[PDB]
Amino acid sequence: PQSFTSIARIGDYILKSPVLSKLCVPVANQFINLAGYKKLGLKFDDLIAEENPIMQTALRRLPEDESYARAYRIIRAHQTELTHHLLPRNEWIKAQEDVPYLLPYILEAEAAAKEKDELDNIEVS
Amino acid sequence: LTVSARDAPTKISTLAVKVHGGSRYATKDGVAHLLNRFNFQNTNTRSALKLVRESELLGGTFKSTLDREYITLKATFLKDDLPYYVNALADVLYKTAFKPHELTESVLPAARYDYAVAEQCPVKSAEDQLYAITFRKGLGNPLLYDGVERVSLQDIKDFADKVYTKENLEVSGENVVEADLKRFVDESLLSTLPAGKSLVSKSEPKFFLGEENRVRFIGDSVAAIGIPVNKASLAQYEVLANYLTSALSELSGLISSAKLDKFTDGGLFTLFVRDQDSAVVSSNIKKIVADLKKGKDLSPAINYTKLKNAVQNESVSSPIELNFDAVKDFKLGKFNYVAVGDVSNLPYLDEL
Amino acid sequence: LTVSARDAPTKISTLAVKVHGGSRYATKDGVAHLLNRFNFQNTNTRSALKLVRESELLGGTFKSTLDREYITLKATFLKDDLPYYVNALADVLYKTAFKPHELTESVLPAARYDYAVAEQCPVKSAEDQLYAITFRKGLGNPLLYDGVERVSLQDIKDFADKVYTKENLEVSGENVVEADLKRFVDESLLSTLPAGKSLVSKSEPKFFLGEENRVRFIGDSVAAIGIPVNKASLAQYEVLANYLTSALSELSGLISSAKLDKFTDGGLFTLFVRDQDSAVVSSNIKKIVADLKKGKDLSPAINYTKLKNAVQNESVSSPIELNFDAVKDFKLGKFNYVAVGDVSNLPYLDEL
Amino acid sequence: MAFRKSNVYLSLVNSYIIDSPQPSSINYWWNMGSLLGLCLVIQIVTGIFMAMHYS
Amino acid sequence: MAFRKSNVYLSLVNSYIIDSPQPSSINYWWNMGSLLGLCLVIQIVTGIFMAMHYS
Amino acid sequence: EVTQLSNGIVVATEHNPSAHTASVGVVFGSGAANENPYNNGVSNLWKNIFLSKENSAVAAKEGLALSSNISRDFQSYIVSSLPGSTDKSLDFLNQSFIQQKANLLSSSNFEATKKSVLKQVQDFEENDHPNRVLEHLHSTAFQNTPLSLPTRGTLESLENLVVADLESFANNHFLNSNAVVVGTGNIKHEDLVNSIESKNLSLQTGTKPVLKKKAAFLGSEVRLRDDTLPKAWISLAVEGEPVNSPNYFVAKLAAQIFGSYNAFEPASRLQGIKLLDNIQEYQLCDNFNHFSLSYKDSGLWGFSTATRNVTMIDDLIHFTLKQWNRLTISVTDTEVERAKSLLKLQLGQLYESGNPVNDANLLGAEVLIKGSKLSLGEAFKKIDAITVKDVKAWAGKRLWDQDIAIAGTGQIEGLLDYMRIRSDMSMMRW
Amino acid sequence: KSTYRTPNFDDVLKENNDADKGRSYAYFMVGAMGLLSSAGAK
Ligand code: HEM
Ligand code: HEM
Ligand SMILES: COc1c(O)c(C)c(C/C=C(\C)CC/C=C(\C)CC/C=C(\C)CC/C=C(\C)CC/C=C(\C)CCC=C(C)C)c(O)c1OC
Numbered sequence A: 001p002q003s004f005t006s007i008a009r010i011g012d013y014i015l016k017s018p019v020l021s022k023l024c025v026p027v028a029n030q031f032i033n034l035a036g037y038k039k040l041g042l043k044f045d046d047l048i049a050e051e052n053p054i055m056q057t058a059l060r061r062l063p064e065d066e067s068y069a070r071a072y073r074i075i076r077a078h079q080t081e082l083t084h085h086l087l088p089r090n091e092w093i094k095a096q097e098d099v100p101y102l103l104p105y106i107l108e109a110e111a112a113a114k115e116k117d118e119l120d121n122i123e124v125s
Numbered sequence B, C: 001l002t003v004s005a006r007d008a009p010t011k012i013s014t015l016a017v018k019v020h021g022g023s024r025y026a027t028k029d030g031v032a033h034l035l036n037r038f039n040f041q042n043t044n045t046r047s048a049l050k051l052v053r054e055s056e057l058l059g060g061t062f063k064s065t066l067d068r069e070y071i072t073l074k075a076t077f078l079k080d081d082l083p084y085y086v087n088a089l090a091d092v093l094y095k096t097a098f099k100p101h102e103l104t105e106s107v108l109p110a111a112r113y114d115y116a117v118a119e120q121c122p123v124k125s126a127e128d129q130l131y132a133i134t135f136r137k138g139l140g141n142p143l144l145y146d147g148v149e150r151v152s153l154q155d156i157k158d159f160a161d162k163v164y165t166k167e168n169l170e171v172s173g174e175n176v177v178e179a180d181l182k183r184f185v186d187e188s189l190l191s192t193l194p195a196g197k198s199l200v201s202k203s204e205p206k207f208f209l210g211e212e213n214r215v216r217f218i219g220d221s222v223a224a225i226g227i228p229v230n231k232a233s234l235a236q237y238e239v240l241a242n243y244l245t246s247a248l249s250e251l252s253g254l255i256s257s258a259k260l261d262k263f264t265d266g267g268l269f270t271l272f273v274r275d276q277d278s279a280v281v282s283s284n285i286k287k288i289v290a291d292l293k294k295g296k297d298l299s300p301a302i303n304y305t306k307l308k309n310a311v312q313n314e315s316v317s318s319p320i321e322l323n324f325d326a327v328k329d330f331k332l333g334k335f336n337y338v339a340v341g342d343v344s345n346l347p348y349l350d351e352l
Numbered sequence D, E: 001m002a003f004r005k006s007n008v009y010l011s012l013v014n015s016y017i018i019d020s021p022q023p024s025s026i027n028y029w030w031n032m033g034s035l036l037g038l039c040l041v042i043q044i045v046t047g048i049f050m051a052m053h054y055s
Numbered sequence F: 001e002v003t004q005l006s007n008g009i010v011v012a013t014e015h016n017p018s019a020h021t022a023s024v025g026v027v028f029g030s031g032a033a034n035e036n037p038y039n040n041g042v043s044n045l046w047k048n049i050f051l052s053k054e055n056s057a058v059a060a061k062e063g064l065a066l067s068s069n070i071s072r073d074f075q076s077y078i079v080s081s082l083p084g085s086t087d088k089s090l091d092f093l094n095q096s097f098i099q100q101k102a103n104l105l106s107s108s109n110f111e112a113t114k115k116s117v118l119k120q121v122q123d124f125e126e127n128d129h130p131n132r133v134l135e136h137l138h139s140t141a142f143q144n145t146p147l148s149l150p151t152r153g154t155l156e157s158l159e160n161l162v163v164a165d166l167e168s169f170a171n172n173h174f175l176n177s178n179a180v181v182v183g184t185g186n187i188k189h190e191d192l193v194n195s196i197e198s199k200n201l202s203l204q205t206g207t208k209p210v211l212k213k214k215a216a217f218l219g220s221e222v223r224l225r226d227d228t229l230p231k232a233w234i235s236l237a238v239e240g241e242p243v244n245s246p247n248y249f250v251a252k253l254a255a256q257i258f259g260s261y262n263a264f265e266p267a268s269r270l271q272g273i274k275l276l277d278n279i280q281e282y283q284l285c286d287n288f289n290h291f292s293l294s295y296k297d298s299g300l301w302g303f304s305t306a307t308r309n310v311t312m313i314d315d316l317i318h319f320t321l322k323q324w325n326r327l328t329i330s331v332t333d334t335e336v337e338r339a340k341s342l343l344k345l346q347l348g349q350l351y352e353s354g355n356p357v358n359d360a361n362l363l364g365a366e367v368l369i370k371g372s373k374l375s376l377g378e379a380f381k382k383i384d385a386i387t388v389k390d391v392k393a394w395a396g397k398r399l400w401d402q403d404i405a406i407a408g409t410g411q412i413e414g415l416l417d418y419m420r421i422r423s424d425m426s427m428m429r430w
Numbered sequence G: 001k002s003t004y005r006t007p008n009f010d011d012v013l014k015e016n017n018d019a020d021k022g023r024s025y026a027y028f029m030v031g032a033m034g035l036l037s038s039a040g041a042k
């Protein structure tokens, strides 16, 4: 509900600031592996809810290959979860494979839908 | 980049930018159609929805049109707002987005609609079959995109990089001051546009005489003929296209349509006959070809075609045709024939 | 009404009745197809559902087949039940119901299925286009019913009154006693069948050489050629149809299919090339026509075609072809060409 | 089609408790809803038979 | 679509008492069913308020 | 400039030096509203006689083009030519249409024209749905009053006509007091008046019949249902403003607010029209348009639509009428500002197109009612003077809780009853 | 008969159709039913 562009302008500023990117990013990286989704084979963007018209738009622009693989990690996590176990250690998600593959599509869809609501309420002088 | 313009006290002024991105110049069949449907999509700065709410308030609309030879970038708006719109037209010729999701969601569904409508009408199908058999690999390229040859987004982007150049452009504005436009023209993003060879070729195409094709169609039956016209004979076939449709001719009640298409180096003269019962089509086509072969006088139609041409010249570049005074006689020597519909009950080229 | 038969100790015997109700004899395009789908519908005495539960218990099934020349009434059953089935076949040739509700509910939906399947396959479309341009109004009649020409129930009934006659009939039964059949033959309802002129014409058809047609198709690309064959040359084109498909020829890996169709007075020799990429089709077709034009020796294939013909003669009337010993050389002089698919990237008849 | 899907009364039972598609990985915390349905029947049935003796 | 047809609860009311297609020539004998529905509500409502005072 | 002189016949002229063509014509103040149900279609027959093969051939030999237009309130006969030959058009108009009518009313010519017109009307009535639906809307809105007669004529009445009906109509309506002589394009007013004065060019005496009943609007509907057609075509309207009303331009602007929509054009899906926000999700319609038509006695304000979604018609009508309801209570200033420029461009192309025939028809139809022609500039200031209060005042009078007229054909089974539609003309929440 | 010709509704129709008088009479009857109904429901 806190959008995504809103929390990304927070990101790129902290990344560029040397004092902030040294203090909190070394604390953020422990928050990811402590969350522990990597062990079931899940990239982060597979965790976001998709039952709204913004995410449904980005899920359609996603290429076939990244949509087929996305289908398999969700099926594997559903199957592994019902057995009350985890995946073998040699198949977990590493640090470098967890890339933002669903980021640009979410961003290009909100700025085109922000424009729509800012044009429906134009007060021409 | 050759700018011409005229001025008049009319309230509404129009601006036109033409690109020689014609279907005779498409790299793959239907590439011209797809780019034409990208025209006025999103650019880098402003979205295509951004362009709508702005051009509405200032009293203008944009259009893009496809034909055998042109991709026309045309705008009709209120007189004072020439500097604003001239930048909007320049952007599309410069920095179109060409995003992948614009091809799937808008361009492809719209391009399919154009093809579907044209397939129901039989005279369009017959006309497209006369172009194909006369100019095999020149003007005969399919106008619309059906998908028998695969066209990708890269081929669209490469085509736009090929046609959108400085030297392949003409900007014309009717009812607005010429000098004011050029100050905005020399300022806009078209000033930085790349320059290249002019896609227009001065050489005439090569033509084939005597070809026939048959298409089995459920509906009306059509017996169409097409003739190649060079540069010198554009005057003779323009009078004849008006004589047959005028009351001066006896075959005017049998003929369904007749026209001449003109280009910078020639044209194709087309004649059509249409009816539901194939028996009526069969008799009508035989009498027309028999009477045409003996001879027809077009001199009574010279004054009629002058008035007809003057009305046409309002919305076109008006190529000069001063030979209307010298047109005397016509007689059919050779032609291409196409039959559409109940081909079993329709005549063959030997029978005509 | 000429009856021939053979006997053998085989358990299963077959009976065939042939009618010269071929598609070359249809009054309107697709009339033969519709009657063929009325065959084994309801009769006056027994319904078509009545015929099923009876012919099942006695170990037989009925079939009807359509081609360019025949409407075959064929039954395969257990040996002893010849008198029973011979009356069932005679009824359909005599007193078919031809009810209006049989055309709407069964014949039309079934006829549409046959056309739909044939349209997806491109070699059938190319073959149908070679028949049409070679024999314009003889064998070139469309085989299947699409509806470009309207066919009514009266035209079906009139066609059945035209073809179902005494003198337009042949009854043949394999593996059952001939004399026993004739006693049942001379007794059944075909004894009272009307007599008329034999629809079969002894005269040869007229043919045209050098025709071409193009069809835009989404899928594979096909470059097919067709040649008319008279009565004397049936032997030469039968060896050649086997030489190209055999390992003795170098072009066998390029060719997709080759065959000869035979009739009572001639045939059409057809050759096909098929691939997905139109570039491969374009090169393959050029090499084949170039090599064929210089010459090919068919003498090594004479023994191969004798074995090939002997297997074919089992299920056909086996016209005599004793000229296999005299076939020596072949060289292509003229042909008809059809292009289906990506017509822009496929060669023209001039280019080949 | 089958009678359990064709009948007017049995098609409601079919689409709610028989052919209803469930996620394949819900744990024992999702069994709580049916236990409340069981307990609602217990309160009512043990209440009607006990309302026959209460003033 | 309209909210009366899109909502889960209002679409049942829509298809039973609002958009239900009726024959155009049914006489006053077909009004009897709604009168029994009116009378069922009368018995229940006048019974709950009268069950507050009955032993 | 527009110059009008009452000397002789009322002569109007609009000079445009840029044009390369000139039109000269006669516009009569009678139309399809001046005929009765028994001779309905006499005007169309007169038009097709003027446009017959022999008349058109004699015209085209000299180099002239003939146009004829039949409407509710006027009949137009126009001869177009090159600028140098504008005097020849007057000679042809005098010799053929006015002085003599015996040749054009011969037996064979009349029979051929009658058989051609019958064929045209028969084809129209079966294979042209959006326009015949609008014709039936007119016929049901103004029933038993002159304005409801179809302009082409009915199939049953066109058979009964003879040449006597045609000559009677010509005697009763082709009069000097009913006519305007119009000049358009590259011609001068002084030259046109001088050319008329040189000839006589007298039409007749005068005193055309006066109608006993004035046109009236009745809330009603007609349904022509046909289940062998693929779509449903629907036209819906209310009473509007007539020509010479103070609220004419307000009516056209309120119409322009909702505009037109085509589902298959990518650009028209991004228009500022808010109605589309409700339509686009379920593909309720293929196309719609809004109209404000004005006649001498009354008018029509409404919309017309076509759709393949035969199961969701009522949703389309409901959302459209709720957008109409918004006009009275909560129209916003940006809507009016967009509407002003859209209307100005809309009016600009109509009155300033290249073709002089449209200008001739408009000038002739205008001077026959107003007595003078409004200029383009003065039109804009009234358009610019429109405010939100004016739109609200007009909408509260013309479409809030008012009777409607409906006409539909095709798969109109989904179209609900009259009253259910009639109740949608108010909100009940306000 | 042509579809454009319409059937006779004269005995059903009012002589003078005035919208303000017509909608006021209908609304008063609906209003009266509502006014007594509100009293009964209370
Ligand atoms: C969800 C439904 C219900 C709940 C949660 C509920 C709960 C309760 C509770 C907590 C008591 C007091 C128990 C005690 O401490 O003694 C009670 C008493 C009672 N309930 Fe219910 N009840 C329900 C439904 C019903 C129904 C449907 C009936 C009758 C038809 C009913 C009849 C009674 C009676 C008669 C008593 C008093 C008898 C007694 O407890 O000694 N109940 N109920
Ligand atoms: C269709 C539903 C019902 C019918 C047909 C019905 C019928 C009756 C009848 C005929 C009587 C006797 C009336 C008499 O002669 O005095 C009665 C009494 C009673 N009913 Fe009902 N009833 C119904 C529903 C209800 C409900 C739902 C309740 C309570 C919630 C209820 C509570 C009572 C009570 C308390 C009495 C006794 C009070 C009295 O009549 O003096 N009834 N009912
Ligand atoms: C989403 O996944 C689902 C799911 O969809 C469903 C439906 C269920 C199933 C749950 C339910 C449907 C619960 C439903 C509960 C109720 C509706 C309560 C039932 C209430 C009643 C039966 C009403 C009371 C009526 C009686 C029982 C009367 C009994 C009669 C008596 C005592 C009279 C006896 C006297 C004599 C004379 C013998 C699930 O468990 C579930 O997850 C697994």
Ligand SMILES: COc1c(O)c(C)c(C/C=C(\C)CC/C=C(\C)CC/C=C(\C)CC/C=C(\C)CC/C=C(\C)CCC=C(C)C)c(O)c1OC
Pocket (backbone or CB within 6 Å): E016, E017, E020, E033, E034, E035, E037, E038, E040, E041, E044, E045, E048, E049
């Ligand atoms: C086919 O055409 C149709 C048609 O389809 C329908 C549906 C109807 C309409 C008919 C019906 C739907 C009838 C429906 C009847 C019922 C379901 C009965 C309703 C029963 C109940 C409401 C259950 C009992 C519950 C209560 C009323 C509880 C009330 C609460 C009270 C008294 C508590 C008050 C206490 C306090 C603290 C204030 C027609 O009339 C009709 O033909 C015109």
Ligand SMILES: CCCCCCCCCCCCCCC(=O)O[C@H](COC(=O)CCCCCCCCCCCC)COP(=O)(O)O
Pocket (backbone or CB within 6 Å): D034, D035, D037, D038
């Ligand atoms: C709302 C209250 C209950 C909530 C729902 C919980 C579901 C439990 C219902 C029990 C039904 C299970 C048997 C299904 C069946 O018929 O299988 C039948 C046959 O199975 C059996 O052998 C039945 C085993 C008997 C156990 C039933 C005990 C009931 C306990 C009481 C539960 C409710 C009070 C279908 O078998 P199938 O798997 O071959 O299709």
Ligand SMILES: CCCCCCCCCCCCCCC(=O)O[C@H](COC(=O)CCCCCCCCCCCC)COP(=O)(O)O
Pocket (backbone or CB within 6 Å): E034, E035, E037, E038, F423, G030, G033, G034, G037
């Ligand atoms: C199950 C028990 C009842 C059976 C069903 C019988 C139907 C009667 C229900 C009454 C509703 C009628 C009004 C509809 C409406 O809202 O129209 C509204 C407004 O109409 C009105 O003016 C309301 C008139 C007030 C009368 C209501 C008295 C109720 C009497 C009690 C009935 C139940 C106990 C919609 O009007 P419209 O025709 O423009 O769409």
